[PDB]
Scaffold this active site. Structure first.
Site, PDB file in Angstrom:
ATOM      1  NE  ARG A  24      -2.483  -1.812   3.312  1.00  0.00           N
ATOM      2  CZ  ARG A  24      -2.964  -1.486   4.699  1.00  0.00           C
ATOM      3  NH1 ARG A  24      -3.889  -0.474   4.826  1.00  0.00           N
ATOM      4  NH2 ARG A  24      -2.305  -2.330   5.527  1.00  0.00           N
ATOM      5  CD1 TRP A  80       5.490  -4.902  -7.410  1.00  0.00           C
ATOM      6  CD2 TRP A  80       4.535  -3.216  -8.657  1.00  0.00           C
ATOM      7  NE1 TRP A  80       5.625  -3.773  -6.661  1.00  0.00           N
ATOM      8  CE2 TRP A  80       5.306  -2.817  -7.395  1.00  0.00           C
ATOM      9  CE3 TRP A  80       3.902  -2.380  -9.618  1.00  0.00           C
ATOM     10  CZ2 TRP A  80       4.934  -1.412  -7.184  1.00  0.00           C
ATOM     11  CZ3 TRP A  80       3.944  -1.039  -9.290  1.00  0.00           C
ATOM     12  CH2 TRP A  80       4.518  -0.411  -8.159  1.00  0.00           C
ATOM     13  CD  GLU A  95       1.724 -11.662  -4.024  1.00  0.00           C
ATOM     14  OE1 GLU A  95       0.453 -11.741  -4.290  1.00  0.00           O
ATOM     15  OE2 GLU A  95       2.341 -10.589  -4.760  1.00  0.00           O
TER      16      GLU A  95
END
Ligand code: HEM
Ligand code: HEM
Ligand SMILES: CNCc1cc(C#N)cc(OCc2ccc3ccc(N)nc3c2)c1
Ligand SMILES: CNCc1cc(C#N)cc(OCc2ccc3ccc(N)nc3c2)c1
Ligand SMILES: C[C@H](O)[C@H](O)[C@H]1CNc2nc(N)[nH]c(=O)c2N1
Ligand SMILES: C[C@H](O)[C@H](O)[C@H]1CNc2nc(N)[nH]c(=O)c2N1
Ligand SMILES: [Zn+2]
Lengths: 409, 413
Positions: free
Chosen positions: B114, B283, B288
């Site tokens: 964020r 992105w 992940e």
């Protein structure tokens, strides 16, 4: 209501009813979750319902709820609270209570062992010398030449708050930490303040990297007194690596017995401010937190150097590489010296089995995901994928303030 | 609720003070007696439900542009009010739509990325009427966001919900994902996470190549109609073959991944309005892919194959062979993206930036809601600074919400 928890890896769903028994606060509200806050948030009239609640669950646990013995115990406790403003637990109740405090410890991944706990009743203790004797016996029994055994030693309960028994050490065995003129820190930075207190109280410091601290023990509210644990009772493991012959040259070691001594045990409204307890280590406790926390021994850089890693960019994951090798070394070293230790894979697996047991036999298991998930390789352990419900049950272990912030000398 | 809540970082001793929690608008699921912080997920608005939700939002917007209480503010409020009164709904201005989307991201407690929230390209697709139009909008989004590897964060917003029987939905969970195929023998080819969706696509007419990394077609629903299938032009789908800087054999595992993470099954809520199709993309953080997508037991599950190739002793867990392989896999993913000049961020950099972001938010905004369980990376947790950071979780609006899978609710025509 009944609450469901799902494992997202295995799709196993368990139903929690046990949470309906909680009467203590978690710190969260409907609108704010404080799940990652480390520490969120008697009288005769306060005391009896707490006492009663506990006596009831004890007699329910031995399947004689509403028996003559149960009825008689309640009446005895009531009179005792009347005439003395407190009461004393039976030996059977002390043991039941201590095992259940462990059983209810939502942050503990080792609870599959909860009913195997050797309880030492030290409620007849009056002096710091007595405390020292009891603690030596505990350490010797628990260590057991490397075949570690879970144990707890329980000192007299709080009366007026002016006569507290306290172990000032945060663990029975820890290493000193020293501030250096050049601003750095020798040994364990976690213990700098405690070390300074010992030195002022007369402890002669060897000024090394792994000096075992003395015990600083407070009995009946009196000023604490220093004691050296006999060295033959302090089991230690030199850390070496199975492949890197240079690792032993790092000079690292650790102690075999993890023995938390600064918590408060609460049973039936009674408060035991000195209740040192110990089990055995999970490798990451030492290999990740104790050795690799930036504010602890902080050794990643030294290790990465000896590994000849390229440490210029974070994306090389040089820290993650060194982290794994350090934890391999700790497990390897404890195992080779035949000192009980568990790895995070085995441990978390046992915890999942434990949860399954507790859901079946008890209707649930309070568990704090933030603490249960290991500090490395999280999602390759099964607890990462396991939904948990956290709630507070009593008997319980609780945080208490450091005694140097309350004590008048 | 106490006016000031403090959070502490146990590594740095830094103490932050949160007041923004007082603006919390929805329930967390926790109560005073239970915490549901590790639970993954703990008929339209009526006129009377809609008025105060809209006003709360419009007030917040005008307060953000320093025109609170202005004539333009009061006029907007009156115009919105009349529109709700006469139509049971209202339309956002383009400025409000942009502000709303940026703030849903800014408010997403589970998002570690964020620090970038105010740099979001917003594509207004509220004029869209058909699945073919949705396809066009999504292709443009993919091409813009991909940018030849220099990824740019973006959101495309389709028409808001009306009566609930005319929803726009993207049936995919991400715009780009790989098919999964359950075999007769019980094994799975491709991504096991996507077996259900893949089966749905096949039933809808998709002809599957039956490979390990087959890019799924888009299944797009406009105006509550039955969803329709489209193939994303392959030149729009940027992929990265995974190799390792040391292990020459790593390339021979035949792994690859797509460059653009574009989540497409969430609902965007702004001022009580519900945008049920709002695919957004940023992105990747390397873990992940390298930890979850590759190493979850229920996903590609490659740890063993890598361990074998690494010649590790896989007989005892205490050799940490899994941990060892996991690091090498994540090194390979970062190395492969950086080598192909495709934007990616490692977990150390991302979490470090998030702590800076959070401190800035506490100082300029009075707080930053954060979900520790999601923010802390799935590997090496405690050597990232977020592990040591106390966080407060609460729900602010505008927000991104979970919604039911559309095949479970769709009324087939
Ligand atoms: C027998 C082997 C045991 C293992 C492997 C084990 C494992 C662990 C670990 C890894 C933690 C996290 C500690 C940290 O990160 O600082 C923990 C927490 C805890 N353990 Fe256990 N434990 C064991 C025995 C015990 C026993 C015997 C007791 C008490 C009778 C106990 C009570 C607790 C409590 C109260 C906490 C949380 C402390 C807090 O809230 O700060 N454990 N355990
Ligand atoms: C720009 C680079 C970005 C990075 C590095 C990033 C990073 C992440 C990561 C690692 C997660 C956890 C994902 C998972 O474990 O499945 C996440 C979650 C999330 N992200 Fe971000 N993100 C980025 C951009 C965005 C954007 C542009 C939006 C929306 C406009 C967004 C909204 C969200 C939301 C709502 C979640 C929680 C999803 C859920 O609850 O299932 N992110 N982000
Ligand atoms: C300083 N770090 C936070 C912390 C605070 C307190 C207190 N008070 C106790 C703590 O207990 C950790 C603990 C407790 C019991 C254990 C039993 C066995 C074991 N291997 N580790 C174990 C670790 C931790
Ligand atoms: C089934 N997995 C859990 C999950 C569910 C949903 C939903 N609905 C969305 C999710 O979003 C994950 C997400 C969202 C936005 C992202 C933006 C950028 C990025 N790199 N990853 C990002 C990852 C995740
Ligand atoms: C801020 C955060 O709650 C704090 O760092 C916690 C996180 N999880 C933990 N988990 C364990 N097992 N031990 C810890 O000390 C911590 N620290
Ligand atoms: C049960 C638990 O809440 C679940 O596995 C969560 C844990 N933390 C996570 N964190 C992220 N970033 N993504 C996830 O999918 C999850 N899964
Ligand atoms: Zn909570």
């Amino acid at each position: 209501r009944f609450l469901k928890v799902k494992n997202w890896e295995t799709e196993v769903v368990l139903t929690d009813t046990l949470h309906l028994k909680s009467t203590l606060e978690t710190g969260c509200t409907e609108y704010i979750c404080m799940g990652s806050i480390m520490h969120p948030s008697a009288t005769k009239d306060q005391l009896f319902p707490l006492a009663k609640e506990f006596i009831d669950q004890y007699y329910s646990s031995i399947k004689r709820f509403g028996s003559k013995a149960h009825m008689e115990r309640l009446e005895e406790v009531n009179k005792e609270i009347d005439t003395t403003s407190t009461y004393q637990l039976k030996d059977t109740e002390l043991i039941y209570g201590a095992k259940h405090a462990w059983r209810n410890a939502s942050r503990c991944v080792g609870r599959i062992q909860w009913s195997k706990l050797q309880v030492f009743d030290a409620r007849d203790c009056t002096t710091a010398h007595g405390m020292f004797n009891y603690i030596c016996n505990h350490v010797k029994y628990a260590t057991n030449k490397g075949n570690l055994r879970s144990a707890i030693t329980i000192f007299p309960q709080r009366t007026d708050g002016k006569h507290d028994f306290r172990v000032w050490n945060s663990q029975l065995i820890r290493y000193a930490g020293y501030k250096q003129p050049d601003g750095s820190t020798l040994g364990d930075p976690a213990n700098v303040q405690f070390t300074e207190i010992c030195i002022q109280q007369g402890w002669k410091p060897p000024r090394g990297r792994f000096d075992v601290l003395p015990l600083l023990l407070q009995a009946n509210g009196n000023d604490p007194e220093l004691f050296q644990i006999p060295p033959e009772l302090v089991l230690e493991v030199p850390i070496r690596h199975p492949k890197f012959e240079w690792f032993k040259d790092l000079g690292l070691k650790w102690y075999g017995l993890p023995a938390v001594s600064n918590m408060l045990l609460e049973i039936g409204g009674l408060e035991f401010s000195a209740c040192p307890f110990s089990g055995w280590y999970m490798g990451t406790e030492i290999g990740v937190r104790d050795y690799c926390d930036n504010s602890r021994y902080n050794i990643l850089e030294e290790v990465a150097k000896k590994m000849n890693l390229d440490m210029r960019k974070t994306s090389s994951l040089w820290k993650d590489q060194a982290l794994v090798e350090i934890n391999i070394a700790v497990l390897y070293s404890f195992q080779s010296d035949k000192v009980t230790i568990v790895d995070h894979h085995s441990a978390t697996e046992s915890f999942i089995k434990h949860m399954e047991n507790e859901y079946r036999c008890r209707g649930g298991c309070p568990a704090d995901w933030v603490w249960i998930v290991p500090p490395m390789s999280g999602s390759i352990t099964p607890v990462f994928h396991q939904e948990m419900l956290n709630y507070r049950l009593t008997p319980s272990f609780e945080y208490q303030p450091d005694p140097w912030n309350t004590h008048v000398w």
